[PDB]
Amino acid sequence: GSSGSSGCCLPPATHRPHPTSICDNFSAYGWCPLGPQCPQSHDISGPSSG
Ligand SMILES: [Zn+2]
Numbered sequence: 001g002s003s004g005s006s007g008c009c010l011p012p013a014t015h016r017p018h019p020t021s022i023c024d025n026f027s028a029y030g031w032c033p034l035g036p037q038c039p040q041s042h043d044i045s046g047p048s049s050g
Contacts, residue, residue, distance in 0.1 A: 019043060 010016075023040035026032040032042060 019041040021040050023032055023034075023038055023042055026038070026040075026042035026044075028047070030044065032038050032040075034040075036042075
């Protein structure tokens, strides 16, 4: 297929900070019974099925 722009992502100047541990509920489900207080991080990436 067509392809031009080589992704408008930030330079390698510095690698972004990585999480310590993602939750199990908010991870996929999206919601968590602990809310923001939850000790685990809640990062919504957006996986695919299939
Ligand atoms: Zn959680």
